[PDB]
Amino acid sequence: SYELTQPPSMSVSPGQTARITCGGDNLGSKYVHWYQQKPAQAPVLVIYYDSDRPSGIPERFSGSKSGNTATLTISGVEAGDEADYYCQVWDSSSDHYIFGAGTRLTVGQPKAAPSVTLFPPSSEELQANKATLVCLISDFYPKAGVETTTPSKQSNNKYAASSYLSLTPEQWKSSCQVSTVEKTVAP
Amino acid sequence: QVQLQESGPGLVKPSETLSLTCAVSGGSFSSDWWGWIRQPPGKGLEWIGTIYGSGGSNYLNPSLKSRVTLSVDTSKNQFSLRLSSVTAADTAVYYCARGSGRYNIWTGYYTPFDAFDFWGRGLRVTVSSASTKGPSVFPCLVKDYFPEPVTVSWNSGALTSGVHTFPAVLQSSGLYSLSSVPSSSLGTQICNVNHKPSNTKVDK
Amino acid sequence: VTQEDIIRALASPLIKDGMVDEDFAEYVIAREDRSPTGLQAKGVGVAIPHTLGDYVRDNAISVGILDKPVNFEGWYQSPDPVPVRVVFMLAGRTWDDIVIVLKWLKDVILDEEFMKRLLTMSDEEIYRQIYTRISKAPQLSGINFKREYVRHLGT
């Protein structure tokens, strides 16, 4: 029945500091540990025991504690510092370890130009009486039988998604609908 | 440099038992506390429980106390998780972590692990009655597979640049599919794909 | 003379009475290298090796008094080893088991007279001193302490 309150998300343009906070009862009498998780990754402990910092964590990451509240401090804000930030506590009563709700980041920041690639079916797929067009958006920061993925972030601090178009081989024997670039498909 | 690698089925039928295992290579497995934490899709982190490396002492989540047991094999530097009577709510990613602890006599603080300093990779577990299907591989193109995830290594691992693997798409059939990404190499200088749930490897 | 020698020596009386397995030394050693237990005291360093596992058969305390101070690294992070001359090996089944004796021992270390008598008395005089102290504490019932768990090890 113990919970850790932290703001759902926070924005910060590059070059500033950060002050992600975490609140809870008697958080002064409790140790608070900060974790940082990026997309497709396991968390990384960045601050442990209120103020102390793990080996290999840049000193721009720091933590502090104020009454029944604690606060991370990410100086030298960069673009890679985007992640969700958690706080944890032990809490003697109700012997469980509570993780904070999470404070999303990634700031705005410089805009980029989308990139598109499209592929045709394969020889074995058509021989197997199936056909699928693979339209690939290799970067994009910020007509039926079609599947499209959600905007998924990439390791280059940009975004990706891949739309697919499934049709029959006979339909093929009888072009990506994304500025707005496009390709064309020919047997 | 404690390295933890998880292992398990990744698909389990509802009302069945999830069995997972963690292999430590860090070295000091007898003396550390090792635990499990899970993160359901799109949600936060839940601690399941933790067990002493040499055996003898468990700490569990009060609300999962009844569904979870824990074990160690010190000789093999492994510890395991058993989750019982599994529901679509247990569909999550499951990590193994080493514990962080700061014991101060003179003070009386002796909580055995306070923070999770080294984490593992994360194994995806899907609670579903659907069965496991091996992907169909095409020139790379991988379609009609379940559950997640699959492996993308190009040139048997040699090509580690210029390759961006694309997140997968859930076909309306309840199936998953995805794909992964010179002007003179042409003839001079194969995609390798493993689906562990189906135990199928295609190095083609 | 290294820490291992003192650990491997204070664990011998325990592996004889069959209160710990024959690899118990390897495990305290391995735990001392991960969480050192060396402490500064009045004129002497104290250490408290312990192992906590499924290989402990019963809880026991093995007290060793050394003759020339041995360096145990520091319980609290400091740049300097603690020249230890008094060693309390602990063997215990669970972490609650060890944390009870652990607290008990803190008051022992805060009892300068109790601590000085240890440095200047015979192995039987020591046994009766602690055995009495263990008797006065009902939290410590079930702990094993015998006359053979006291040893004046020498460098």
Numbering used by the authors:
A (entry chain H): 1 to 107, 109 to 143, 158 to 189, 194 to 197, 202 to 210
B (entry chain G): 1 to 139, 156 to 197, 201 to 208, 211 to 225
C (entry chain C): 4 to 158
Give the original sentences from the paper that presented this experimental model:
We developed germline-targeting epitope scaffolds with affinity for 10E8-class precursors and engineered nanoparticles for multivalent display. Because the MPER region is sterically occluded at the base of full-length membrane-bound Env and absent from most soluble native-like trimers, epitope scaffold immunogens were previously designed to conformationally stabilize and expose the C-terminal MPER helix. To assess the structural mimicry of the MPER helix within the epitope scaffold and the interaction of the epitope scaffold with the 10E8-class D gene YxFW motif, we determined three crystal structures and one cryoelectron microscopy (cryo-EM) structure of 10E8-GT epitope scaffolds complexed with 10E8-class human antibodies.
Attempts to solve cocrystal structures of a nonglycosylated variant of 10E8-GT10.2 in complex with several high-affinity Fabs from 10E8-GT10.2 12mer-immunized macaques yielded one structure in complex with a high-affinity (Kd = 4.8 nM) Fab at 3.1 Å from a macaque that lacked a permissive DH allele. As such, 10E8-GT nanoparticles induced 10E8-class bnAb precursors that shared key structural features with mature 10E8 in rhesus macaques.
